[model samples]
Target: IEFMRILHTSDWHLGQNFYSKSREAEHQAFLDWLLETAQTHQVDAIIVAGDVFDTGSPPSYARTLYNRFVVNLQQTGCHLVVLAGNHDSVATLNESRDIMAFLNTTVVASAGHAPQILPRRDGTPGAVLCPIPFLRPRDIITSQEKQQHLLAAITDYYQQHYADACKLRGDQPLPIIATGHLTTVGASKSDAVRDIYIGTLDAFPAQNFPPADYIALGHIHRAQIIGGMEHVRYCGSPIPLSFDECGKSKYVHLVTFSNGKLESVENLNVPVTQPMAVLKGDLASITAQLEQQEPPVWLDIEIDEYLHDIQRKIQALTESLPVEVLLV
Candidate 1:
C-alpha cells in the first residue's frame, strides 16, 4: 500500500487580465492553496505541464508572484518540474535555470533535454518525468520543410526523446511518466486558450505520443482523459480562464506510484476562491438573481432583448456588490 504521490497541474497564467481587470488576488489564492495541498498530500514532486504565464512579457507584478511562489514552495521540499508552454518565452523562463535548480525546481523551456528523474521522499527510486515543453515549428523543422511536414517532425521529436530517456535508464524500469503541452485529439478546448498548434493539424492522436505509464498534458483548459484513456490526462487550469469556463469545476491530478510501478490516479478538486457566473436574460431577471446570490462574484451578462440605457441598468445592479461585470 506504500506509494509515492505526485501532483500534476498547469496553466497558471499568472497576471492574466480578465476583461482588462487584474486577477492577481485570485491567482494568489490558488497558489496559496496549491502549496498547502502539496505539503498536506506529501507529494514527492509537483509537475506543471505548461502555460506558466499568460503572455511572453507579463507584468512585473506577475513575475513577482511567480518568483515569490517558487521561493515559498521550496519550504515544502517538493521537487518541481515546470515546462514552458507556447505562451511562455523560452529564453525568459530558461534564464533562471541554475537558480531554480538550487531550489530543486527543474524548468524545461526547450526540447531535446533529458528526462527528469525524481527522487523519492524516502530516498528510494521514484518516477522518471519526460518533460516535453511546447514544440515550435522552428525547434523541430526548418522553415523550408515546416509547411509540408510539420506534424511529422513534432512526432519524431517526441519519439526520439522518449527513446533517449529510456536509454538513459538502461533497463531499470521505473514508473515512466511523460508530459506534453500540446492539444490531443478529441479534447474540448476553451476560448481563452491561444492557438499554439501548427496549421490545421493542431492535435496529436493519443497513439502518436511516446509510450508511458501516464501522460500528463496541458494547453487544453478543460480537464479530461484523452480518447477514454485514463492514463493520458489533461489536469486543466487551476482556475477558469474565460467566461465560458464559469461554473466548470477545475482540478489537479494526484498520481501515485508504488514499487516503481503505476498505482492510482486521483482528482483533487481545486477550491474556487472567487465564483464566476455568466448571466443572460432581461435586466430585471438578471438583477433579481444577482440580489439573491452571495457577494464577490465575477459576472458576464447578456441581454436577451434590446433595452433602453442597458449600461446604466447594469451599473446600478452591480453597484455596492463585489460583482465585476466582465461582459454586458
Candidate 2:
C-alpha cells in the first residue's frame, strides 16, 4: 500500500501587497509556482496552515488572487484546507468560506468553533483537521480574566474543544493534522514582529493534543522545529515579512505519514529565496540609490540616513522593493 504524502504551507499573506504597495503580478506568479509544486509531488492534500489573506480587509486585488488560487486548486483533485491567521478578518474569511465549500475546498474562519474537517480521498479516516486562528485576548476572554495570562486562557478553551470533538466523532485518534496561528514556546522569529502574550496565566501546553499525529504551526516567520521532530512543525512564511528575515531560507514543508508516524522534507531553493532584504541609510538614499525591485516580497529597512520625513522616505523605499510588509 502506498503511504500518504501531504504538503504543509503557511503565511501566504495574500492581499498584503507588501510594503503597503501593489503586488498583483508577483503574487500571481507565486501561486502558480505553488500549484506547480503540488502537481509535481502528486500530493494527497495541500494544507495552507494559516495567514492566507494579508489582512482582515484585503483589497480587490487580493480577492482576485484568492479566487484564482481556489479555482485552480480544483483541477488538482486534491483537498485544499485553509485556516485563518492574525491578518485575516473573520467576516471576510467567512464570506469566502460560504462560497468555496461548494467548490471542493475547506476554509476555517471561526475562533468560537473548531476547523471544518475534511477527509482524505480514500475515506479511511485519513486525518482529523483542526485550525486555531490567532485569538486576540478580546476574542475569547476579557482583559481582566486574561490579565493573568491571555494566551493560556485562550488556547486552553480551544485545545479542550479540539481534543473533545475528535474523540466524540467515533474515530480512533487518527493521524491528526492541525493548523494554528500562535507563538509556540520555542518557535523562532525574524523580521516579523511578535506580540508576546503577557498575561501571567500560562497559555497552551503541548499536551493539549493528547493524540495528535502532527501539528502545522504558523505566525512565527522563521521555519523551525518545536521540541524537535516531524510531529510539530512550522512551515513559516513563503516569503519574509521584514528585513530582519534576511538570510533566512524561504520554503514549505512536505510531509509524509504512515502508520501514524511522520517523515518530512523541506522544499527549498539552491541559494534559497532571499529570506530578508533590507536597505538602510535614510529614506532618499535607500530609495534614490535603489534600482528595479520585486514587489510583494518580504523585507526590512532601518532608518540610518537623516531624512526630514520618515513616512515619505519609507514610501519611496516601498516603491523600490515592492515588499509586502516592512519593519523599522
Candidate 3:
C-alpha cells in the first residue's frame, strides 16, 4: 500500500564554513527556504536524513538559524524527522526533545541505541526509522579486542533494531524507512573529513535492511540509490559540498506514498540565492571579469598563482556591483 508523501533530505550542515569563513546567513536562508518549499509542495512529512548542524556545538547565530526554521515548521503542518550526523552532538540535538516531542517531530541522537517504531494515523503500521549516529574508528576501536567489540556492537544493534521493527508489525506489513548515517556501495559522493577509513569495517550489505518500501539515508554527499535496493536512497547534501559539486543542481528527494504504493521519487531543486562563479587567471583578468558581473554572488575566484593582490582585485571588482562580495 502506497502512502501519501515523504520528503527526503540530508546534510543541512548548518554553520558550514566556506574556506574558513562562516556561512551563517546563507545557512539560515537555506533552512527558511526548505520549510517554505515543504509547504509549497504540501508534503505529508519532511525527513532531514542527517547532519543538521555543521559543528557539535553550533555557534549562537547558527543555533538561532535552526530555531527559526524549527519554529516555522509548525506552520507547515508536516511531520519532521531528523537524525544526528557525524558533525552533530547527540546531546545538543536532544537537549529540548521533551518540548519538541510535543510538536509533530522526531529526532534520533544516539550512537549505540535505536528508537521505537513510529506509527502514523493511517491503518498501516508506520515506517521504521533508525537514525544511526556516526561511527568513527576512534569511537569504538584501537586494538584487536576493541575492533571485535565494535563490530559486535554495530551488528548487535542493527539486528536488534530489525527485530524491534519487525516485531511491531506481527501481521501488518509496514514500510520501513531506515534513516542512518552510512556509506553504502552505490552511494554517489563523499567527503574525506566526515568519513573514516577502516579497512576491515566494510559497509554493511544492502541486504541488512528488512523488506521495506524505502530507506532514507545520509552521510553520502550525493543523491543516489543503494545497490540492489530500489527502495533505499540517499537524499544527498542540499548544497554543493565541494568545488567539484558546484555545477550540479542540489536538491532533496520527494516521494509520494499514496494508499500504500510507493509513488514516484523526484529531486526537488534548491534555488541558488547567489550565483557560484569560477573565474581563473591572473588577478587582472579575474578582476576585470568580476567588474562586468554582479556582486553578492559567492564567487570561488582563483588566481594563477598564490598572490597577495587578491584583495585589491576583489575591491576593484566589487566597486562596480551594487552588493558586496564574499570570496572563497
Candidate 4:
C-alpha cells in the first residue's frame, strides 16, 4: 500500500519575455500553485525534466525567481531533481549544486552522474532516477566519423549511460526512471522549442532508451505518451510558451510507484492562472467576444476582414478589457 507519489513537470523557461511582455507574475503564480499542489498531494519527489531557464545567460531576475522557488520548495519536504535542457547552461546550474543539495534538491546539468536513489519515509528505496541532461555534440561524439550519424551517436550515449546507471542499482530492482531533454521521433513540437537539431538526426527513437519504469522527456511542448507506450512520456511545458499552444491543456504527471514497480500514472492538469485566448473574426464578432471575456487574458487576434489602421482599431476595440495582445 505504500506508494511513492512523484510530480513530473518540465520546461519552466523562467525569465521568458513572451511577445515583448513580461511573464513574471504568471510564473510566480505557477510556482506558488506547484508548491501547494506538491504539499497537498504529499509528493515524495518532484522531477523537472529540463529547461529551467529560457537561455544560458538568464537575467538576474530569472535567477532570483529560481532561487526563490527552490527555497520555497524546501518547505514541502519533497526531493527535487532538475536536469539541463539544450537551452540551459550546465555550468550555470551546477554552480549552486552544493547549496541546493542541502535543500534535498539535485541538479543534473551534465551526463555520467549516478542515478539518484530517493529515500522514502520508511528509509526504503522509493525510486531510482537516471538523470540524463541534454547531450551536446562533444558529449557523445568521440570522433568526427561517429558525428556523421548523429542519432546513432546520441542513442549510444543514452544506452551507455543507462547501462552505467543500472550497475549502480546492484540488484535493488527499484523503479528506474530515465530522464532526457532530447526530442523523440513523432513527438509534437511547439514554437517555443527552438530546433535543436535538423531532420531525423535531431530526434532519438523512443525505443533507443534502455528498459526503465518510465522515460520522462522534455524539449517537446506538447504532452504525449511516446510510441503509445504509457511509460514513455513528455510532461510538457507548465505554461504555453507560444500563442500556438493557447487553449491546449498542459499537464504535469503524477507517477505512483509501489513495491519497486510503477503502480499508475496520472496527468494532472496545470491550473490556468493566466489563460490565453486566440480570437479570430470580423470586427463586430471580435468586439462581441472581447466584451464578454474577463480580465488578464493573453489575446492573439486575427482579423478575418480588412480594416484601416488595424493596430489602432484593435486597441480601440480591446480598450475596456484587461488584455495583452500578444499577436495580431
The best candidate by TM-score is 1
Tens-place lDDT per residue, model 1, 1-328, is: 4577899999988878888878788888888998999899898988899899998888999988888888999888888898899889998888887889998889899977787677767766577778888887767774434333867887787788788767766666577888988887788999987776547466678888877888889888888899888789999999999989878988999998876677888888888877788887776778677765453687888762345478777787778776778788
Ten consecutive residues with minimal summed lDDT in candidate 2?
A: 268-277
Worst 10 residues of 4 by lDDT: 139-148
Kindly give the stretch of ten consecutive residues in candidate 3 with the minimal lDDT sum: 115-124
Give the TM-score ranking, best first. 1, 4, 3, 2
lDDT at position 9, candidate 1: 95
Stretches of candidate 4 off by over 4 Å are 144-148, 293-295, 304-309
Q: Per-residue lDDT for 37 in model 3?
A: 82
Residue 153 of model 3 has an lDDT of 57
In order of appearance, the predictions have TM-scores of 0.92, 0.77, 0.80, 0.91
Report the Cα RMSD per candidate. 2.3, 5.0, 3.9, 2.4
Q: How far in Å is the alpha carbon of 6 misplaced in model 4?
A: 1.6
Write one digit per residue (lDDT tens) for candidate 3, span 217-249.
787777777885557887878877655566777
Model 1 residue 57 lDDT? Answer: 84
Model 4: per-residue Cα lDDT over 184-278, one tens digit each: 88888987888876553656779888888888898889899998899999989988888889789989999988777788889888877777888
The C-alpha stretches of model 3 lying farther than 4 A from their native spots are 112-125, 135-156, 190-193, 197-208, 258-261, 281-295, 304-328
> Model 1: which ten-residue window has the lowest total lDDT?
142-151
| Model 2 accuracy (lDDT, Cα) | 0.66
